[PDB]
Coordinates of C-alpha atoms and ligand atoms in Angstrom, one line a residue:
Chain A
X1 CA 180.6 -71.1 -204.5
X2 CA 181.0 -71.7 -200.8
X3 CA 183.4 -68.7 -200.3
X4 CA 181.0 -66.5 -202.4
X5 CA 178.1 -67.4 -200.2
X6 CA 180.2 -66.9 -197.0
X7 CA 181.2 -63.4 -198.2
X8 CA 177.8 -62.2 -199.3
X9 CA 175.9 -63.6 -196.2
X10 CA 178.4 -62.2 -193.8
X11 CA 178.6 -58.7 -195.5
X12 CA 177.0 -55.8 -193.7
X13 CA 173.9 -54.7 -195.5
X14 CA 170.7 -53.8 -193.6
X15 CA 168.1 -51.8 -195.5
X16 CA 169.7 -48.5 -196.6
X17 CA 173.3 -49.4 -195.8
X18 CA 174.2 -52.0 -198.4
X19 CA 177.4 -50.5 -199.8
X20 CA 179.6 -53.3 -198.6
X21 CA 177.4 -55.9 -200.4
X22 CA 177.6 -53.9 -203.6
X23 CA 181.4 -53.7 -203.3
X24 CA 181.6 -57.5 -202.8
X25 CA 179.3 -58.1 -205.8
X26 CA 181.4 -55.8 -208.1
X27 CA 184.7 -57.3 -207.0
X28 CA 183.4 -60.8 -207.5
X29 CA 182.1 -59.9 -211.0
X30 CA 185.4 -58.3 -212.1
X31 CA 186.2 -59.8 -215.5
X32 CA 182.8 -61.4 -215.8
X33 CA 180.5 -58.5 -216.8
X34 CA 180.6 -56.0 -219.7
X35 CA 179.4 -53.1 -217.5
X36 CA 177.6 -52.0 -214.3
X37 CA 175.9 -49.0 -213.0
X38 CA 173.8 -47.9 -210.0
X39 CA 170.4 -46.3 -210.8
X40 CA 169.0 -43.4 -209.0
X41 CA 167.1 -45.6 -206.5
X42 CA 170.2 -47.5 -205.5
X43 CA 169.7 -50.7 -207.5
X44 CA 173.0 -52.2 -208.8
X45 CA 172.7 -53.3 -212.5
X46 CA 175.3 -55.5 -214.3
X47 CA 175.2 -57.1 -217.7
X48 CA 176.9 -59.6 -220.0
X49 CA 176.2 -60.9 -223.4
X50 CA 174.8 -59.6 -226.7
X51 CA 171.8 -61.9 -227.6
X52 CA 168.6 -60.3 -228.9
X53 CA 166.6 -61.6 -226.1
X54 CA 167.0 -59.6 -222.9
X55 CA 166.6 -61.2 -219.5
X56 CA 166.8 -59.7 -216.0
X57 CA 167.8 -61.8 -212.9
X58 CA 166.8 -59.9 -209.8
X59 CA 167.8 -60.6 -206.1
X60 CA 167.3 -58.3 -203.1
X61 CA 170.4 -57.0 -201.5
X62 CA 169.2 -55.9 -198.0
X63 CA 169.1 -58.0 -194.9
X64 CA 166.9 -57.6 -191.9
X65 CA 168.3 -55.8 -188.9
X66 CA 167.8 -53.1 -186.2
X67 CA 168.3 -49.4 -185.8
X68 CA 169.1 -47.5 -182.6
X69 CA 166.3 -45.2 -181.6
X70 CA 167.4 -44.0 -178.1
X71 CA 170.3 -44.0 -175.7
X72 CA 169.6 -43.8 -172.0
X73 CA 171.6 -42.2 -169.1
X74 CA 173.5 -45.4 -168.4
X75 CA 174.6 -46.1 -172.0
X76 CA 171.9 -48.7 -172.9
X77 CA 170.4 -48.5 -176.4
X78 CA 166.8 -48.8 -177.5
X79 CA 166.2 -50.4 -180.9
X80 CA 163.4 -51.0 -183.4
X81 CA 163.4 -53.6 -186.2
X82 CA 164.4 -53.0 -189.8
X83 CA 162.5 -55.6 -191.7
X84 CA 161.1 -58.8 -190.3
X85 CA 163.2 -59.2 -187.1
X86 CA 161.2 -60.8 -184.4
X87 CA 162.1 -59.7 -180.8
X88 CA 162.2 -63.4 -179.9
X89 CA 165.1 -63.9 -182.3
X90 CA 167.1 -61.2 -180.5
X91 CA 167.0 -62.4 -176.9
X92 CA 170.5 -63.0 -175.5
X93 CA 171.8 -62.4 -179.1
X94 CA 174.7 -60.2 -180.2
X95 CA 174.3 -57.5 -182.8
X96 CA 177.0 -56.1 -185.0
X97 CA 176.7 -52.4 -185.8
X98 CA 178.0 -50.6 -189.0
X99 CA 181.1 -49.2 -187.3
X100 CA 182.0 -52.7 -185.9
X101 CA 180.6 -52.2 -182.4
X102 CA 179.2 -55.4 -180.8
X103 CA 176.2 -55.2 -178.5
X104 CA 174.3 -57.7 -176.4
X105 CA 170.5 -57.8 -176.4
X106 CA 168.9 -57.9 -173.0
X107 CA 165.3 -57.9 -171.8
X108 CA 163.7 -55.7 -169.1
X109 CA 162.3 -57.3 -166.0
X110 CA 163.9 -58.2 -162.6
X111 CA 161.4 -60.6 -160.9
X112 CA 160.8 -64.0 -162.4
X113 CA 157.2 -62.9 -162.7
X114 CA 158.0 -59.7 -164.6
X115 CA 160.4 -61.5 -167.0
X116 CA 157.9 -64.3 -167.6
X117 CA 155.1 -61.8 -168.4
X118 CA 157.5 -59.9 -170.6
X119 CA 158.6 -63.0 -172.7
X120 CA 155.0 -64.1 -173.0
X121 CA 154.1 -61.0 -175.0
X122 CA 157.7 -59.8 -175.9
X123 CA 157.9 -56.5 -177.7
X124 CA 160.8 -54.3 -178.8
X125 CA 160.2 -51.7 -176.1
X126 CA 161.1 -54.4 -173.5
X127 CA 164.5 -55.0 -175.2
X128 CA 167.8 -53.0 -174.9
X129 CA 171.3 -53.4 -176.2
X130 CA 174.4 -53.3 -174.0
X131 CA 177.5 -52.0 -175.9
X132 CA 179.6 -51.8 -172.8
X133 CA 179.1 -48.1 -172.3
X134 CA 178.8 -46.5 -168.9
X135 CA 177.1 -43.2 -169.9
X136 CA 175.0 -41.7 -172.6
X137 CA 178.1 -39.8 -173.9
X138 CA 180.2 -42.9 -174.2
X139 CA 177.4 -44.8 -176.0
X140 CA 176.6 -41.8 -178.3
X141 CA 180.2 -41.7 -179.5
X142 CA 180.3 -45.4 -180.1
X143 CA 176.8 -46.0 -181.5
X144 CA 174.7 -42.9 -182.1
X145 CA 171.0 -42.9 -182.5
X146 CA 170.2 -43.9 -186.1
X147 CA 173.0 -46.6 -186.2
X148 CA 172.1 -49.8 -188.0
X149 CA 172.9 -53.2 -186.8
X150 CA 172.6 -56.8 -188.1
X151 CA 172.9 -60.2 -186.5
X152 CA 176.4 -60.9 -185.2
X153 CA 176.4 -64.3 -186.8
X154 CA 178.4 -65.8 -189.6
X155 CA 178.7 -68.7 -192.0
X156 CA 179.1 -72.3 -190.8
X157 CA 178.7 -75.7 -192.5
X158 CA 176.3 -78.0 -190.7
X159 CA 176.9 -81.5 -192.0
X160 CA 176.7 -80.5 -195.7
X161 CA 174.1 -77.7 -195.1
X162 CA 175.1 -74.1 -195.2
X163 CA 174.0 -71.9 -192.3
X164 CA 174.4 -68.1 -192.0
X165 CA 172.6 -64.9 -191.5
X166 CA 170.9 -63.2 -194.5
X167 CA 170.4 -66.2 -196.8
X168 CA 167.3 -64.1 -197.5
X169 CA 168.3 -62.9 -200.0
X170 CA 172.2 -63.1 -200.2
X171 CA 171.8 -66.6 -201.5
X172 CA 169.8 -65.2 -204.4
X173 CA 172.6 -62.6 -204.9
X174 CA 175.1 -65.5 -204.8
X175 CA 173.1 -67.4 -207.5
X176 CA 173.2 -64.4 -209.8
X177 CA 176.9 -63.7 -209.3
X178 CA 177.8 -67.4 -209.9
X179 CA 175.7 -67.5 -213.1
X180 CA 177.5 -64.4 -214.4
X181 CA 180.9 -66.0 -213.5
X182 CA 180.1 -69.2 -215.5
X183 CA 177.7 -68.3 -218.3
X184 CA 178.4 -67.9 -222.0
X185 CA 175.1 -66.0 -222.5
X186 CA 172.8 -66.7 -225.4
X187 CA 170.9 -63.6 -224.2
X188 CA 171.7 -60.1 -223.2
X189 CA 171.7 -60.9 -219.4
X190 CA 171.1 -58.3 -216.7
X191 CA 171.8 -58.9 -213.0
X192 CA 169.9 -56.5 -210.7
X193 CA 170.8 -56.4 -207.0
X194 CA 167.8 -54.5 -205.9
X195 CA 166.8 -52.3 -203.0
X196 CA 163.4 -52.4 -201.3
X197 CA 161.4 -49.4 -200.1
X198 CA 160.2 -49.3 -196.5
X199 CA 156.7 -50.5 -196.0
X200 CA 154.5 -47.4 -196.0
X201 CA 156.4 -45.6 -198.7
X202 CA 156.3 -45.4 -202.5
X203 CA 158.0 -48.4 -204.1
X204 CA 159.8 -49.4 -207.4
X205 CA 162.1 -54.1 -214.7
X206 CA 164.1 -51.3 -213.2
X207 CA 165.8 -48.9 -215.5
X208 CA 166.4 -51.5 -218.2
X209 CA 164.0 -52.7 -221.0
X210 CA 164.0 -56.5 -221.1
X211 CA 161.8 -59.4 -222.3
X212 CA 161.8 -61.4 -219.1
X213 CA 162.5 -60.8 -215.4
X214 CA 163.3 -63.7 -213.1
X215 CA 163.3 -63.0 -209.4
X216 CA 165.8 -65.2 -207.4
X217 CA 164.4 -65.3 -203.9
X218 CA 164.2 -67.6 -200.9
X219 CA 161.1 -69.5 -199.8
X220 CA 160.3 -71.2 -196.6
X221 CA 161.4 -74.9 -196.4
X222 CA 158.5 -76.6 -194.6
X223 CA 160.3 -79.9 -194.0
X224 CA 161.0 -79.5 -190.2
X225 CA 159.3 -81.5 -187.4
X226 CA 155.4 -81.6 -187.4
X227 CA 155.1 -79.7 -190.6
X228 CA 151.8 -80.9 -191.9
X229 CA 151.3 -79.0 -195.2
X230 CA 150.6 -80.0 -198.7
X231 CA 152.6 -78.0 -201.3
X232 CA 155.6 -78.1 -199.0
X233 CA 159.0 -77.0 -200.3
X234 CA 161.9 -79.0 -199.0
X235 CA 165.7 -78.8 -198.9
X236 CA 167.3 -80.8 -201.7
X237 CA 164.1 -80.6 -203.6
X238 CA 165.7 -78.2 -206.1
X239 CA 164.8 -74.7 -207.1
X240 CA 161.2 -73.8 -206.3
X241 CA 159.4 -72.5 -209.4
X242 CA 156.5 -70.2 -208.3
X243 CA 153.0 -70.9 -209.6
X244 CA 151.5 -67.4 -209.4
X245 CA 147.8 -67.2 -209.2
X246 CA 147.3 -64.1 -211.4
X247 CA 150.2 -64.6 -213.8
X248 CA 150.0 -63.2 -217.3
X249 CA 150.1 -65.3 -220.5
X250 CA 153.7 -64.2 -221.0
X251 CA 154.7 -64.9 -217.4
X252 CA 153.3 -68.5 -217.6
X253 CA 155.4 -69.0 -220.8
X254 CA 158.6 -68.4 -218.8
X255 CA 157.5 -70.8 -216.1
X256 CA 156.8 -73.5 -218.7
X257 CA 160.2 -72.8 -220.3
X258 CA 162.0 -73.4 -217.0
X259 CA 160.1 -76.6 -216.4
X260 CA 161.1 -77.9 -219.8
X261 CA 164.7 -76.9 -219.3
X262 CA 164.8 -78.6 -215.9
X263 CA 163.2 -81.8 -217.1
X264 CA 165.3 -82.0 -220.3
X265 CA 168.6 -81.5 -218.4
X266 CA 167.7 -83.7 -215.4
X267 CA 167.7 -80.8 -212.9
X268 CA 165.7 -81.2 -209.7
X269 CA 163.0 -78.7 -209.1
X270 CA 159.8 -78.3 -207.2
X271 CA 156.6 -76.3 -207.9
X272 CA 155.7 -73.7 -205.3
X273 CA 151.9 -73.2 -205.0
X274 CA 150.6 -70.5 -202.6
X275 CA 155.3 -54.7 -216.7
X276 CA 158.0 -57.2 -217.7
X277 CA 156.7 -60.8 -217.8
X278 CA 158.2 -62.5 -214.8
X279 CA 158.9 -65.7 -213.0
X280 CA 160.2 -66.5 -209.5
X281 CA 162.8 -69.1 -208.7
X282 CA 163.5 -69.6 -205.0
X283 CA 166.0 -71.4 -202.8
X284 CA 164.3 -73.5 -200.1
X285 CA 165.5 -72.1 -196.8
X286 CA 165.0 -73.2 -193.2
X287 CA 164.7 -70.8 -190.3
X288 CA 164.1 -67.7 -192.4
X289 CA 164.6 -64.4 -190.5
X290 CA 166.7 -66.2 -187.8
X291 CA 170.4 -65.7 -187.4
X292 CA 170.8 -69.3 -188.6
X293 CA 169.1 -69.6 -192.0
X294 CA 169.9 -72.9 -193.6
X295 CA 170.1 -74.0 -197.3
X296 CA 171.2 -77.1 -199.1
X297 CA 174.1 -76.4 -201.5
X298 CA 172.8 -78.9 -204.1
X299 CA 169.6 -76.7 -204.4
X300 CA 171.8 -73.7 -205.1
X301 CA 173.9 -75.5 -207.6
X302 CA 170.7 -76.8 -209.3
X303 CA 169.4 -73.2 -209.5
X304 CA 172.6 -72.0 -211.1
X305 CA 172.5 -74.9 -213.6
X306 CA 168.8 -74.2 -214.4
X307 CA 169.6 -70.6 -215.2
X308 CA 172.7 -71.4 -217.2
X309 CA 170.8 -74.1 -219.3
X310 CA 168.0 -71.6 -219.9
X311 CA 170.1 -68.6 -220.7
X312 CA 173.4 -69.9 -221.9
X313 CA 174.7 -70.7 -225.4
Chain B
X1 CA 196.6 -24.9 -214.8
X2 CA 195.0 -24.4 -218.3
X3 CA 196.4 -27.5 -219.9
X4 CA 195.7 -29.6 -216.9
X5 CA 192.1 -28.5 -216.9
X6 CA 191.8 -29.1 -220.6
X7 CA 193.2 -32.6 -220.3
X8 CA 191.1 -33.6 -217.4
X9 CA 187.8 -32.2 -218.6
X10 CA 188.2 -33.6 -222.1
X11 CA 189.1 -37.1 -220.9
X12 CA 186.6 -39.8 -221.4
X13 CA 185.2 -40.9 -218.0
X14 CA 181.6 -41.8 -217.4
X15 CA 180.9 -43.8 -214.3
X16 CA 182.7 -47.2 -214.3
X17 CA 184.9 -46.3 -217.3
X18 CA 187.4 -43.7 -216.0
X19 CA 190.6 -45.4 -217.1
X20 CA 191.7 -42.4 -219.1
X21 CA 191.1 -40.0 -216.3
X22 CA 193.2 -42.1 -213.9
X23 CA 196.0 -42.3 -216.5
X24 CA 196.0 -38.5 -217.0
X25 CA 196.1 -37.9 -213.2
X26 CA 199.1 -40.2 -212.7
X27 CA 200.9 -38.7 -215.7
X28 CA 200.4 -35.2 -214.3
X29 CA 201.5 -36.4 -210.8
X30 CA 204.6 -38.3 -211.8
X31 CA 207.6 -37.0 -209.8
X32 CA 205.2 -35.2 -207.4
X33 CA 203.9 -38.1 -205.3
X34 CA 205.5 -40.7 -203.1
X35 CA 203.2 -43.5 -204.2
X36 CA 199.7 -44.5 -205.4
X37 CA 197.3 -47.4 -205.6
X38 CA 194.1 -48.2 -207.4
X39 CA 191.7 -50.3 -205.3
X40 CA 189.3 -53.0 -206.4
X41 CA 186.5 -50.5 -207.1
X42 CA 188.7 -48.1 -209.1
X43 CA 189.5 -45.4 -206.6
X44 CA 192.8 -43.9 -207.3
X45 CA 194.7 -42.9 -204.1
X46 CA 198.0 -41.0 -204.1
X47 CA 200.1 -39.8 -201.2
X48 CA 202.9 -37.4 -200.4
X49 CA 204.6 -36.3 -197.2
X50 CA 205.2 -37.9 -193.8
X51 CA 203.7 -35.4 -191.3
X52 CA 201.9 -37.0 -188.3
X53 CA 198.6 -35.5 -189.4
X54 CA 196.9 -37.4 -192.2
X55 CA 194.6 -35.5 -194.5
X56 CA 192.5 -36.7 -197.5
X57 CA 191.6 -34.4 -200.4
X58 CA 188.8 -36.1 -202.4
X59 CA 187.2 -35.4 -205.8
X60 CA 185.1 -37.7 -207.9
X61 CA 186.3 -38.7 -211.3
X62 CA 183.1 -39.8 -213.1
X63 CA 181.2 -37.4 -215.4
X64 CA 177.6 -37.5 -216.2
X65 CA 176.5 -39.2 -219.3
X66 CA 174.2 -41.7 -221.0
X67 CA 173.9 -45.5 -221.3
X68 CA 172.6 -47.4 -224.3
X69 CA 169.6 -49.5 -223.3
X70 CA 168.3 -50.7 -226.7
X71 CA 169.1 -50.9 -230.4
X72 CA 166.3 -50.9 -233.0
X73 CA 166.2 -52.7 -236.4
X74 CA 167.5 -49.5 -238.1
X75 CA 170.4 -49.0 -235.8
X76 CA 169.0 -46.2 -233.6
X77 CA 169.9 -46.3 -229.9
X78 CA 167.7 -45.9 -226.9
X79 CA 169.4 -44.3 -223.9
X80 CA 169.0 -43.6 -220.2
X81 CA 170.8 -40.9 -218.1
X82 CA 173.7 -41.7 -215.9
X83 CA 173.9 -38.9 -213.4
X84 CA 172.1 -35.7 -213.8
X85 CA 171.7 -35.3 -217.5
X86 CA 168.5 -33.5 -218.4
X87 CA 166.9 -34.6 -221.7
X88 CA 166.7 -30.9 -222.7
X89 CA 170.5 -30.7 -222.6
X90 CA 170.8 -33.5 -225.1
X91 CA 168.5 -32.3 -228.0
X92 CA 170.6 -32.0 -231.1
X93 CA 173.8 -32.6 -229.2
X94 CA 176.6 -35.0 -230.1
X95 CA 177.6 -37.8 -227.7
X96 CA 181.0 -39.5 -227.7
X97 CA 181.4 -43.2 -226.8
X98 CA 184.5 -44.9 -225.5
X99 CA 185.9 -46.1 -228.8
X100 CA 185.5 -42.6 -230.4
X101 CA 182.1 -43.3 -231.9
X102 CA 180.1 -40.1 -232.2
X103 CA 176.3 -40.1 -232.1
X104 CA 173.7 -37.4 -232.6
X105 CA 170.7 -37.1 -230.2
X106 CA 167.3 -36.9 -232.0
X107 CA 163.8 -36.6 -230.7
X108 CA 160.8 -38.6 -231.9
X109 CA 157.9 -36.8 -233.6
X110 CA 157.3 -36.6 -237.4
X111 CA 155.0 -33.5 -237.6
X112 CA 155.6 -30.1 -236.0
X113 CA 152.7 -30.7 -233.6
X114 CA 154.1 -34.0 -232.4
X115 CA 157.4 -32.3 -231.7
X116 CA 155.8 -29.4 -230.0
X117 CA 154.0 -31.9 -227.7
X118 CA 157.1 -33.9 -227.0
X119 CA 159.3 -30.9 -225.9
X120 CA 156.6 -29.7 -223.6
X121 CA 157.3 -32.7 -221.3
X122 CA 160.5 -34.1 -222.8
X123 CA 161.5 -37.5 -221.5
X124 CA 164.3 -40.0 -222.4
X125 CA 161.8 -42.4 -224.0
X126 CA 161.3 -39.8 -226.8
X127 CA 165.0 -39.5 -227.5
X128 CA 167.3 -41.7 -229.6
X129 CA 171.0 -41.6 -230.7
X130 CA 171.9 -41.9 -234.3
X131 CA 175.5 -43.3 -234.7
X132 CA 175.2 -43.6 -238.5
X133 CA 174.3 -47.3 -238.5
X134 CA 171.8 -48.7 -241.0
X135 CA 170.9 -51.8 -239.0
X136 CA 171.0 -53.3 -235.5
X137 CA 174.1 -55.4 -236.6
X138 CA 176.0 -52.3 -237.7
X139 CA 175.0 -50.4 -234.5
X140 CA 175.8 -53.3 -232.2
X141 CA 179.4 -53.6 -233.5
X142 CA 180.1 -49.9 -232.8
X143 CA 178.0 -49.4 -229.7
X144 CA 176.5 -52.4 -227.9
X145 CA 173.8 -52.2 -225.3
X146 CA 175.4 -51.0 -222.1
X147 CA 177.8 -48.6 -223.8
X148 CA 178.4 -45.3 -221.9
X149 CA 178.5 -42.0 -223.7
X150 CA 179.6 -38.6 -222.6
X151 CA 179.1 -35.1 -224.1
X152 CA 181.1 -34.6 -227.2
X153 CA 182.2 -31.1 -226.1
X154 CA 185.7 -29.8 -225.2
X155 CA 187.6 -27.1 -223.5
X156 CA 187.5 -23.5 -224.7
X157 CA 188.5 -20.2 -223.1
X158 CA 185.7 -17.5 -223.1
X159 CA 187.1 -14.0 -222.3
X160 CA 189.2 -15.4 -219.4
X161 CA 186.6 -18.0 -218.2
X162 CA 187.2 -21.7 -218.8
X163 CA 184.4 -23.7 -220.3
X164 CA 184.3 -27.4 -220.8
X165 CA 182.3 -30.5 -220.1
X166 CA 182.7 -32.2 -216.8
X167 CA 184.0 -29.3 -214.6
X168 CA 181.9 -31.3 -212.2
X169 CA 184.1 -32.7 -210.9
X170 CA 187.3 -32.7 -213.1
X171 CA 187.9 -29.2 -211.8
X172 CA 188.1 -30.7 -208.3
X173 CA 190.5 -33.3 -209.6
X174 CA 192.6 -30.6 -211.2
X175 CA 192.7 -28.7 -207.9
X176 CA 194.0 -31.8 -206.1
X177 CA 196.6 -32.5 -208.8
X178 CA 197.8 -28.9 -208.7
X179 CA 198.1 -29.0 -204.9
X180 CA 200.3 -32.1 -205.1
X181 CA 202.4 -30.5 -207.9
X182 CA 203.2 -27.5 -205.7
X183 CA 202.9 -28.4 -202.0
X184 CA 205.7 -29.2 -199.5
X185 CA 203.3 -30.8 -197.1
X186 CA 203.3 -30.5 -193.3
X187 CA 200.9 -33.5 -193.2
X188 CA 200.8 -36.9 -194.8
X189 CA 198.6 -35.8 -197.7
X190 CA 196.3 -38.3 -199.5
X191 CA 194.6 -37.5 -202.8
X192 CA 191.5 -39.7 -203.5
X193 CA 190.1 -39.6 -207.0
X194 CA 186.9 -41.5 -206.1
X195 CA 184.3 -43.7 -207.8
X196 CA 182.5 -44.3 -204.6
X197 CA 179.0 -43.7 -206.1
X198 CA 179.5 -46.9 -208.0
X199 CA 178.6 -48.8 -204.7
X200 CA 176.2 -46.1 -203.4
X201 CA 189.3 -45.5 -198.7
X202 CA 191.5 -47.7 -196.7
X203 CA 193.4 -44.7 -195.3
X204 CA 192.8 -43.9 -191.5
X205 CA 193.1 -40.1 -191.9
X206 CA 192.4 -37.4 -189.4
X207 CA 190.6 -35.0 -191.8
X208 CA 188.9 -35.3 -195.2
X209 CA 188.2 -32.3 -197.5
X210 CA 185.9 -32.9 -200.5
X211 CA 186.7 -30.7 -203.5
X212 CA 183.5 -30.2 -205.4
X213 CA 181.6 -27.9 -207.6
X214 CA 178.7 -25.7 -206.6
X215 CA 176.2 -23.7 -208.7
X216 CA 177.3 -20.1 -209.4
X217 CA 174.0 -18.2 -209.1
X218 CA 175.1 -15.0 -210.7
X219 CA 173.4 -15.2 -214.1
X220 CA 170.3 -13.2 -215.2
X221 CA 167.4 -13.0 -212.8
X222 CA 169.4 -14.8 -210.0
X223 CA 167.9 -13.1 -207.0
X224 CA 169.0 -15.6 -204.2
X225 CA 170.8 -13.7 -201.4
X226 CA 174.2 -14.9 -200.4
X227 CA 174.5 -16.6 -203.8
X228 CA 177.8 -18.2 -204.8
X229 CA 179.4 -16.3 -207.6
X230 CA 182.3 -16.6 -210.0
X231 CA 185.5 -14.8 -208.7
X232 CA 184.1 -15.0 -205.1
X233 CA 186.7 -17.6 -204.2
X234 CA 186.5 -21.1 -202.9
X235 CA 183.0 -21.8 -201.5
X236 CA 183.3 -23.2 -198.0
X237 CA 180.3 -25.4 -197.1
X238 CA 178.3 -24.7 -194.0
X239 CA 177.0 -27.8 -192.4
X240 CA 174.2 -28.1 -189.8
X241 CA 174.6 -31.7 -188.7
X242 CA 178.4 -31.3 -188.5
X243 CA 180.4 -32.7 -185.6
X244 CA 182.6 -30.4 -183.5
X245 CA 185.6 -31.8 -185.5
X246 CA 184.0 -31.1 -188.9
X247 CA 183.2 -27.5 -187.9
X248 CA 186.8 -27.1 -186.7
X249 CA 188.1 -27.9 -190.2
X250 CA 185.8 -25.3 -191.7
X251 CA 186.9 -22.7 -189.1
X252 CA 190.5 -23.6 -189.8
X253 CA 190.0 -22.9 -193.5
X254 CA 188.3 -19.6 -192.8
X255 CA 191.3 -18.6 -190.7
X256 CA 193.7 -19.6 -193.4
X257 CA 191.8 -17.6 -196.0
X258 CA 191.8 -14.5 -193.9
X259 CA 195.4 -14.8 -192.6
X260 CA 196.8 -15.5 -196.1
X261 CA 194.5 -12.9 -197.8
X262 CA 192.7 -15.5 -200.0
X263 CA 189.2 -14.7 -201.3
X264 CA 186.5 -17.0 -200.1
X265 CA 182.7 -17.3 -199.8
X266 CA 180.4 -19.2 -197.5
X267 CA 177.9 -21.7 -199.1
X268 CA 175.0 -21.4 -196.7
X269 CA 172.5 -24.0 -195.5
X270 CA 169.4 -24.6 -197.5
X271 CA 166.4 -26.0 -195.5
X272 CA 182.9 -40.8 -190.9
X273 CA 186.2 -39.0 -190.3
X274 CA 185.7 -35.3 -189.8
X275 CA 185.2 -33.6 -193.1
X276 CA 184.7 -30.2 -194.8
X277 CA 183.7 -29.3 -198.4
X278 CA 185.4 -26.7 -200.6
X279 CA 183.7 -26.0 -203.9
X280 CA 184.5 -24.3 -207.2
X281 CA 181.7 -21.9 -208.3
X282 CA 180.5 -23.2 -211.6
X283 CA 177.9 -21.9 -214.0
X284 CA 175.7 -24.1 -216.2
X285 CA 176.4 -27.3 -214.2
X286 CA 175.3 -30.5 -216.0
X287 CA 175.4 -28.8 -219.4
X288 CA 178.1 -29.3 -222.0
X289 CA 179.4 -25.9 -221.2
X290 CA 180.2 -25.7 -217.5
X291 CA 182.0 -22.5 -216.7
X292 CA 184.5 -21.6 -214.0
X293 CA 186.7 -18.6 -213.3
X294 CA 190.4 -19.6 -213.1
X295 CA 191.1 -17.2 -210.2
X296 CA 188.7 -19.2 -208.1
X297 CA 190.5 -22.4 -208.9
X298 CA 193.8 -20.8 -208.1
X299 CA 192.5 -19.4 -204.8
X300 CA 191.3 -22.9 -203.9
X301 CA 194.7 -24.4 -204.7
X302 CA 196.3 -21.6 -202.6
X303 CA 193.9 -22.2 -199.7
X304 CA 194.8 -25.9 -199.5
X305 CA 198.5 -25.3 -199.9
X306 CA 198.6 -22.8 -197.1
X307 CA 196.4 -24.9 -194.8
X308 CA 198.4 -28.1 -195.4
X309 CA 201.9 -26.9 -196.4
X310 CA 205.1 -26.7 -194.4
Ligands
NA401 NA1 202.6 -41.1 -211.4
NA402 NA1 179.9 -34.2 -215.4

């Protein structure tokens, strides 16, 4: 599963430009699905099995990133965030653009005073990206306005932990793919690798009737220094099963099912305390929205096992 | 080209299941190409020639259709569209599935009033497909959930016009095949029979020309000016956002048409590697009876052969 996670997390797929991720998902699923299609909205749907009960597993396919909004006379780029990228995570960082261009993020300010006031209240309008261009014309040919970029950071093993960009939510995508690769389904199983509308716009179950929908997401792992929170999710604590405050009767039934499956098959799990009946299963992740998101492989394996025990014959 | 168009339009090839279309294309191209490959997504790429300039001709091989999304206790199928199938185009129509299973599309509504209400705002949730099964078990053996169906229509010649399903875009596929059959290329010529919409081609070409279909707006009450029409020739697509290089391809094609005396028409604006689009005027797009004029297809083949040939 390590190579699968490496490929999916390293793939280029900021919001709206996720074609490479869909391609990797389809190639990885070759010989393991009965069919696939893309719906009008861009969601990738795959399926396997013929059981009477129909179940959707849903993971988001986009990653956070940036988009070029301006090019100045000296070839420097202005950017804005796509998703939850903090400007503080971009300082001195490298960005990989869709066409392969690498850029360096710098901050405006010459004097120590100016730079210090700028970092104290850092905003995107104080950042720029250097792609090595010496003119607007050079930069426009290399990285036109509207170009998307992602963290130029890849997969690395950190003493048994896995670290990469875009664990949120490529690790969920990886869980679903791996379940499809292994499972002999007792259900009709759907995998949905879903898009998300920009905040401010109309938003999207999908184009498939089903009895249950399980979202495979990430959740913050609050097990780092000085974390002083009850209800804390931790690495190696297992899949996090979400206790939703306003959940329907049918949704609570799914949650209880998963608890029983986990307990009966000796699968580690933890309870996360904040239409198709739904449940959420999450991978505990450190440093969400950084270029170095971190998971514990045993949590991911436990999540795959939980789903296979629940849905497999 | 008649038999080539018959075979390609009648072939079974909804999105994701185009094996028969690829087989026909390679059978028609045997002895006319230098090589081919099918990539991991299912794109079929062929090539011929060794000129320094590399040119791609692209057409997509999927046709519109339906996908089975449920089966009820009595064997009736629930369906969703794949591509631009209107529910009004399915009423009382036959659908063919991959193993040759034929189904009939029905609409819910017992009384005349219920049916009158349902056709006023027809939606897929009021449609079903009857494949002759008498139970879920019988239906699931023939046509499991996730099965794709296409129109159960075929090719017929109508007073010199060609009518079939899937002119969009099997007619573009046919154009590319016919070019490879006839051309002695001055370029290295690539033909890409694409499935790229499956992910929303490993050839570093200099130009790409998409061969597509465009609506022929020459039917009754069509009052749009500069409308595309049957027998007006290949429709050359005007692009507003186009690069200088993309505009150059379009200007090149206009010059070829005029210098070789090939009929052509300009598809006006409505408000990657350099590319242009050349389209076949087609009536009744997305119906089971898409209609082209063979002289437009021939003119399109000629345009590409004269642009790209030695
Ligand atoms: Na061949
Ligand atoms: Na079609």
